[PDB]
Write a protein that binds this ligand. Structure first.
Ligand SMILES: NC(=O)c1ccc(N[C@@H]2C[C@H](CO)[C@@H](O)C2)nc1
Ligand SMILES: NC(=O)c1ccc(N[C@@H]2C[C@H](CO)[C@@H](O)C2)nc1
Lengths: 237, 237
């Protein structure tokens, strides 16, 4: 229906089995709600040893991805995607991914994800081949595959059929009623669906306030939310 | 030497092949610098259908991880790790991972990573079994496996043997000298190792300032850095 096609450029395409063969995303793939298609720059080399790295100009500790195989893989992905495909490069220098950012990306019917390895890719390929640079967080990884899979999983949840407000989640409880002396909050046992809703929202507001206060600043709280938060803050003091 | 052992609790242990069988982390594992050991709550069930989910008290859209199999898997991981193992739960409600946070976690010789599925896990298990809750970013995923692998990859880079300052990376260039009309910056061709160092640092400062200005506020710049940044800002204006 609103299905999604995701092209991936990667030296290690088999890593993507982690999302394509397991769990909710695995189901999404099997049911054709999500299509993940991989191209490997190694398949685009022509030398005997299938070389996919190259030396950086200016010297330096490491290597970069070799331009020609990577550029050719990217072109092959663009042609198979047709028009409308947004090309994304995953790196710490990119725009920081958050949930709003995920929902923005979810609007695309087609994405191509370029996963760098070694010390990265040539700056000119970013200029000429990449539409947007994104980061999943301010940390450095050995390759862009985990960030690419992270982004795929997050956008997948917005595809209709895949699944069944600015605050941290409330605590959840399941059997048994008592666990190491710790009891389930009575309200959750009450059946009072409206007290339960309010308790959960209050918990979310309190947790957000204690753990991630800056998140509250980006929000225009409803009257009910303002009240429950104030309550929570009174009880805390 | 300073090798690292990481226990993982997960309903989909095969996802971890993505890091254990490929690239730098795959090499780390083969060379015994990194050991990743998985326990699956499904192996700890006793009912005919190996049930690993359970209904949340208070009602709600989804399911939680069933307490008994998950708790038993966790206990089995703790006993195999011995003393000193820090137990981490991956979730959006956790402390936000960044590079400083990665280096802190890298100090642990033993970690146990608990990967939630469905709508999460019982709050009491977090209280009684989890030492620290961490998030890899402010977005929601179908499971904690990708965040756990993300954390493993990031800390792996700090294990000696695995590989070969608050700013975004500089641009890098490799062959060819001209690509779609775009030339490599002459300084990188000069061989002048000191001009190259300065150009790279200046680029990093400029990129950080333009893309992620808030990152500069957490830094005490050196005199050289202050100068190069000011230069960059003058040229920009
Ligand atoms: N936070 C992220 O999204 C992220 C992306 C990539 C990454 N590392 C890869 C390897 C390659 C060389 O660093 C470069 O292209 C990017 N680390 C972190
Ligand atoms: N940003 C993160 O580290 C992160 C962690 C987990 C996650 N989802 C899993 C599934 C499960 C139910 O939501 C819960 O335990 C956590 N999403 C994001």
């Amino acid at each position: 229906g609103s299905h999604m096609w995701i092209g991936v450029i990667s030296l290690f395409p088999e890593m993507f089995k982690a999302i394509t063969e397991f769990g909710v995303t695995g189901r999404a793939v099997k049911h054709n709600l999500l299509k993940v298609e991989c191209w490997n720059p190694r398949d685009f080399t022509f030398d005997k040893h299938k070389t996919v790295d190259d030396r950086p100009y200016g010297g330096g500790p490491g290597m970069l991805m070799m331009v020609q195989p990577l550029r050719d893989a990217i072109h092959t992905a663009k042609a198979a995607a047709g028009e409308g495909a947004k090309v994304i490069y995953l790196s710490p220098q990119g725009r920081k991914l958050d949930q709003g950012g995920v929902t923005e990306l979810a609007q695309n019917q087609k994405l191509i994800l370029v996963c760098g390895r070694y010390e990265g890719i040539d700056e000119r390929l970013i200029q000429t081949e990449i539409d947007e640079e994104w980061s999943i967080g301010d940390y450095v990884l050995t390759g862009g595959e985990l960030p690419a899979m992270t982004l795929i999983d997050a956008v997948a949840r917005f595809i209709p059929g895949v699944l069944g407000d600015g605050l941290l989640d409330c605590p959840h409880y399941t059997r048994p009623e008592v666990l190491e002396g710790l009891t389930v909050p009575p309200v959750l046992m009450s059946g009072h669906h409206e007290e339960i809703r309010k308790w959960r929202l209050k918990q979310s507001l309190q947790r957000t306030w204690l753990r991630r206060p800056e998140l509250l600043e980006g929000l225009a709280l409803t009257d009910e939310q303002r009240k429950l938060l104030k309550e929570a803050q009174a009880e805390h003091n």
